[PDB]
Amino acid sequence: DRPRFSFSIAAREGKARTGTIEMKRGVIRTPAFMPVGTAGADIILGNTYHLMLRPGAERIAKLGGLHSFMGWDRPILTDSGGYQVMSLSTKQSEEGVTFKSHLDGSRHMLSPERSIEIQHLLGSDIVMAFDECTPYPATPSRAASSMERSMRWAKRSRDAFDSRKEQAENAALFGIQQGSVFENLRQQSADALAEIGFDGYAVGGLAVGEGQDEMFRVLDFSVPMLPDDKPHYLMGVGKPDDIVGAVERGIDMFDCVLPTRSGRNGQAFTWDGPINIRNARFSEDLKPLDSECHCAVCQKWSRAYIHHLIRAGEILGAMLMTEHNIAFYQQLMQKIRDSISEGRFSQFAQDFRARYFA
Amino acid sequence: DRPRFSFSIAAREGKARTGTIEMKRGVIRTPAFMPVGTAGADIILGNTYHLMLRPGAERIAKLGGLHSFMGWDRPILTDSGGYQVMSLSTKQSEEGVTFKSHLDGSRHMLSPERSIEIQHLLGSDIVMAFDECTPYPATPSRAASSMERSMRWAKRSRDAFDSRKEQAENAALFGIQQGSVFENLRQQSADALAEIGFDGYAVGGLAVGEGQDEMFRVLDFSVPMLPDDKPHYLMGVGKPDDIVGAVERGIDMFDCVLPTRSGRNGQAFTWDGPINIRNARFSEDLKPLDSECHCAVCQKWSRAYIHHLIRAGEILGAMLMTEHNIAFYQQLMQKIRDSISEGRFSQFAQDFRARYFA
Ligand SMILES: [Zn+2]
Ligand SMILES: [Zn+2]
């Protein structure tokens, strides 16, 4: 019987690590890419914000929880809902966030306690603390005030999680570091989260428009501040090259809507970079989407045929693109894990970039 | 090695028949439903009209033909393109049809000879004669003039097909009966087609807004006019109940865009009739789309989850609906074939209607 939560590091190269997270519902190989569930993967993401508006968290619980609902019996991660509320809905206070639903007009409050309860009703295995994703750019004073509130909210998240026996005994709770791009605030945030104690630690407040150079600069000093012996989750990242560089800086877990978003808009990821399959240059191209990809799409169909389907507005085309993209991301993570395990990740990263950007 | 074309009838009940068409690329079990290829099935449909505008028939041939292009090595049926040109594009003459492409503005002529050549370039296994689908309603004089032109065009289609060695030796040619709703014209058309000689015979000019009662009335006298020992193809039909009644009247082959169209617009076919899965009554319904369906969707997911996906605009939802609908149609045809073979099709049709319309 697997434990509630156990992270083991099997191999290291520089700051990069590869290992496993064992949970009751399955093993997660790291570094891990965690795709959206409604799009192989060891863990998927549920969409807390959407689910709390349609059908409602109580309704999901009545239907048996998200695992039963989605037909997925392996681990599920849910975000805490505030990023999305603050992105797509609002009134903020020390208690939480108030907002109105575009779907039906109803009012909703979200607080650390309510966020944890919603994630409990959904039945997720990895629960995110309820935080404030500081806007970018932020002044030192605004970044500090926001980070300090998020740390108070992290303690409230911890207490709410621990009060629910079924959750505390079967799920895991991750804290989220904030502090914008400022080293001293990232340090204060890390210290506060470690004093509370979490099962894993996310780097929040990035992939919010700062650009890769700045993101990598912040990762350079921020990830070493987190406990080495716990997983590190970079929220919202990212492009294949962002993932490779973030792994080089000690990140273990990733989520991003790009594979699914790109697959709906004609973009395929390949080892030679992204391509827009609708472009006329693919109309007679008999090669598969990627010449090395092991996925079922590249086993059977050409760029020319997928180009044809998408240009025709056929749903099959978008589904084949999405399947390919999700598969590409999992192949990227497998190559990352194997190369770290084999002590050749530095060479892999160099080879990856030379070809991806050629 | 299979023959170019051989139709055998294994069992009969009333006017209904069940059997097989053997072609070089595979066996087709009849009665057969023939789904759109870009949506198990023994034969799929290519979209001649679309393919001749994008990428062009010559380009498909350069890419290896439709079998290679689509990744489908079993039989393919193509329509002759005139119905669509006359539906979606025009100037008509004894030579053919002239029309302009909305895609690029270019001009196109379609004639019996060009239609046959396009279908040759596409590489289809069952080729339709180039006909005029008479509009509905039609006067006796207009229906006769149109039918007479279609019969002259049927002879020109036969001659063009026979002139192409690779086509005459490896593909099959179907003639299309016209004559609107008029018994004497349907008889003249049947006689003309039988004198020319075809591998199979389609009933054209129906499913054009006449309604099921009138369609069945025309089938009642029209299908017996065709050679009994050759397949009978009802073009454009149809709803599950249209198919059952048409089989009762001697039809062997069907095509219809409803399974795919419905699956894109929230409608699922079930043994208890069609349902609109977006309706709120399905939001907490844990049953599969259909309680008896053997398809992979109904094996794994609920109405509530598919409702959720479609309401969320997720591509996965439309794909699961379409998979279910195509599978439902093939299960319907399997039950039709088995019941005719077992001498209980009359009972099946009665039981089907009592439940489908309950
Ligand atoms: Zn692939
Ligand atoms: Zn089904």
From Swiss-Prot, chains A, B:
Homodimer. Within each dimer, one monomer is responsible for RNA recognition and catalysis, while the other monomer binds to the replacement base PreQ1. GO terms for cellular component: cytosol. Catalyzes the base-exchange of a guanine (G) residue with the queuine precursor 7-aminomethyl-7-deazaguanine (PreQ1) at position 34 (anticodon wobble position) in tRNAs with GU(N) anticodons (tRNA-Asp, -Asn, -His and -Tyr). Catalysis occurs through a double-displacement mechanism. The nucleophile active site attacks the C1' of nucleotide 34 to detach the guanine base from the RNA, forming a covalent enzyme-RNA intermediate. The proton acceptor active site deprotonates the incoming PreQ1, allowing a nucleophilic attack on the C1' of the ribose to form the product. It comes from Zymomonas mobilis subsp. mobilis (strain ATCC 31821 / ZM4 / CP4). Residues 236-242, 260-264 are annotated as: RNA binding. Keywords: Glycosyltransferase, Metal-binding, Queuosine biosynthesis, Transferase, tRNA processing, Zinc. Its EC number is 2.4.2.29. PANTHER family: QUEUINE TRNA-RIBOSYLTRANSFERASE. The keyword Cell division does not apply. Pfam families: TGT. It catalyses: 7-aminomethyl-7-carbaguanine + guanosine(34) in tRNA = 7-aminomethyl-7-carbaguanosine(34) in tRNA + guanine. Its cofactor is Zn(2+). Binds 1 zinc ion per subunit. The gene is tgt. This is Queuine tRNA-ribosyltransferase. Pathway: tRNA modification; tRNA-queuosine biosynthesis. Belongs to the queuine tRNA-ribosyltransferase family. InterPro entries: ArchSynthase1/Queuine_TRR, TGT, TGT-like_sf, tRNA_ribo_trans-like. Changing residue 131 to A: Abolishes catalytic activity. GO terms for molecular function: metal ion binding; tRNA-guanosine(34) queuine transglycosylase activity. The active site is at 79 (proton acceptor), 255 (nucleophile). The keyword ATP-binding does not apply. Zn(2+) binds at residues 293, 295, 298, 324. GO terms for biological process: queuosine biosynthetic process; tRNA wobble guanine modification; tRNA-guanine transglycosylation.
